[PDB]
């Protein structure tokens, strides 16, 4: 199936970010998708997410692991620009400004093997 960037045009994505940030100024707009070809981890039902500004990557990883109903022992990586974040205590509002895409979304992919 097509990725989010392939299902929505660039100009549609830009406009959506502008409008959703007006409506929810304390939330960060995040696209979360399963890594291409990943089979151990399941698919999320939705693609577009709103994350409160204060949530850090450690907390977000916990949230997503719970949403996927993962076992505590199994590997899981949340990749922002193809790599795991090591500064897991910084709030996502700060991650957003450094790592957002050209379209204004913050893109994440999750995988089960070597980040």
């Amino acid at each position: 199936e097509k990725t989010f960037k392939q299902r929505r045009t660039f100009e549609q994505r830009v406009e959506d970010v502008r409008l959703i940030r007006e409506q929810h100024p304390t939330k960060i707009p995040v696209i979360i998708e399963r890594y291409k070809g990943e089979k151990q981890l399941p698919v999320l039902d939705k693609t577009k997410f709103l994350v409160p500004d204060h949530v850090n990557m450690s907390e977000l990883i916990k949230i997503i692991r719970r949403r996927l109903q993962l076992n505590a022992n199994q590997a899981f990586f949340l990749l922002v620009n193809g790599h795991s974040m090591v500064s897991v205590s910084t709030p996502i509002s700060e991650v957003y400004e450094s790592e957002k895409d050209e379209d204004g979304f913050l893109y994440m992919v999750y995988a089960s093997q070597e980040t």
Binding site: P29, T47, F49, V51, V55, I64, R67
Partner: peptide, 9 residues
Amino acid sequence: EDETWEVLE
């Protein structure tokens, strides 16, 4: 098509 958002907290 699905334009909705899920809130993560």
